[PDB]
């Protein structure tokens, strides 16, 4: 039993996409999550993962809609930031 | 497997050589004290208290004051 | 210094260079060159184990190798015997062409005049 991080295993394209892959041994450019909206969406998945199984179907849906609304508000802020960057 | 094979074969030779290194560092540390000991007896030129730098830094600084 | 593959070299192991120095067993050795590189020379040496000799190959740099003259005595003899044999056949007497071990000294007399012997005590007092 050894870690996949230590072995030089290539990333494989699955239903979950690989995306753009950064080269090994070079600068993996840091993206910051200082924004409160970007802080809320990460917080929604942490609280959802720890809570686990809920018997209620409605409360199970509200646990997912909180994550969905957090993603939408963050995306609107990022698009407004992208528009402000395009103006500048 | 290659690494464990060489450590299985060298083994005691590393253990003996490590003891000779540790016996050498005791000699070097004791000799460096005696160079300090002869220097202060020949002369000195110090402060009220000893220097805040650790050993092999304060001693090397005193041996660079020559 | 230019070296060729096959000559006889002596390894000295100078302490000025710490690169390419062989073991202390290979210090003060003599072997035959089998490989020549840019900065190192491969020398085949002989090492005895119990009764046989196992040939070992070591890479020694230029700074530790030097030519020898062990063969040079053999080639000095092979011309000296050649000229002597031609010079002997020219006038027609045999000559001992071999080298012989040192023999015991023959009898002789030693005069005592001008060299009167001095008597010596077991320890010197003066």
């Amino acid at each position: 039993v050894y870690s996949e991080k230590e072995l030089g295993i290539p990333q494989l394209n699955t239903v979950t996409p690989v995306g753009v892959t950064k080269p090994k041994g070079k600068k993996k450019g840091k993206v910051f999550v200082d924004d409160r909206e970007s802080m809320n969406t990460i917080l929604a998945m942490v609280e959802a993962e720890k809570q686990g199984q809920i018997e209620s179907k409605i409360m199970r849906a509200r646990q997912l809609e909180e994550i969905r609304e957090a993603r939408r508000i963050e995306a609107e802020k990022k698009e407004a930031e992208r528009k402000a960057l395009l103006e500048n | 497997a290659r690494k464990q094979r060489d450590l299985k074969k060298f083994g005691k030779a590393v253990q003996v050589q490590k003891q000779l290194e540790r016996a050498k560092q005791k000699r070097e540390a004791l000799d460096k004290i005696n160079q300090l000991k002869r220097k202060r007896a020949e002369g000195g030129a110090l402060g009220a208290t000893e220097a805040d730098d650790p050993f092999d830094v304060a001693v090397d600084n005193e041996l660079s004051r020559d | 210094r230019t070296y060729r593959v096959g000559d006889i070299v002596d390894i000295k192991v100078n302490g000025a260079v710490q690169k390419g120095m062989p073991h202390k067993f290979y210090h003060g050795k003599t072997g035959v060159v089998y490989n020549v590189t840019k900065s190192a020379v491969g020398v085949i040496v002989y090492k005895r184990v119990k009764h046989r000799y196992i040939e070992k190959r070591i890479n020694v740099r230029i700074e530790h190798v030097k030519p020898s003259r062990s063969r040079e005595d053999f080639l000095r003899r092979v011309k000296e015997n050649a000229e002597l044999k031609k010079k002997a056949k020219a006038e027609g007497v045999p000559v001992q062409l071999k080298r012989q071990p040192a023999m015991p000294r023959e009898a002789h007399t030693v005069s005592i005049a001008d060299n009167k012997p001095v008597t010596l005590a077991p320890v010197a007092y003066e």
Partner: protein, 104 residues
């Protein structure tokens, strides 16, 4: 040194019992030709084990820092010396005292 400290986790197993501790040392001055009992300030260099330096082990040849306030050493610029190097010149494992010579 101090009465109560919370050691790092890396040193918490190493128990030094209270009956095996020393606070003062018999320290001799090479030039004044006297021996006085001086308090120990810190253990500076154990020349056998680096871990013994961190644990404070007193060993023959170990440099310690002693308070020389009672000795009245007048340094350059007219200052009374207060901390000096001393080399332990005995084996405190075998005898129940610490003997040192000042590195002055």
């Amino acid at each position: 040194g101090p009465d109560f400290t919370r050691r790092p986790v890396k040193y918490e197993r190493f128990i030094r019992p209270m009956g095996l501790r020393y606070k003062k040392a018999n320290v001799t001055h090479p030039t004044l030709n006297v021996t006085v009992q001086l308090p120990i300030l810190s253990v500076k260099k154990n020349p056998s084990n680096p871990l013994y330096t961190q644990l404070g082990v007193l060993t023959k040849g170990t440099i310690i820092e002693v308070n020389v306030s009672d000795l009245g050493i007048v340094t350059a610029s007219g200052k009374i010396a207060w901390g000096r190097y001393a080399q332990i010149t005995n084996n405190p494992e075998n005898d129940g005292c610490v003997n040192a010579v000042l590195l002055v």
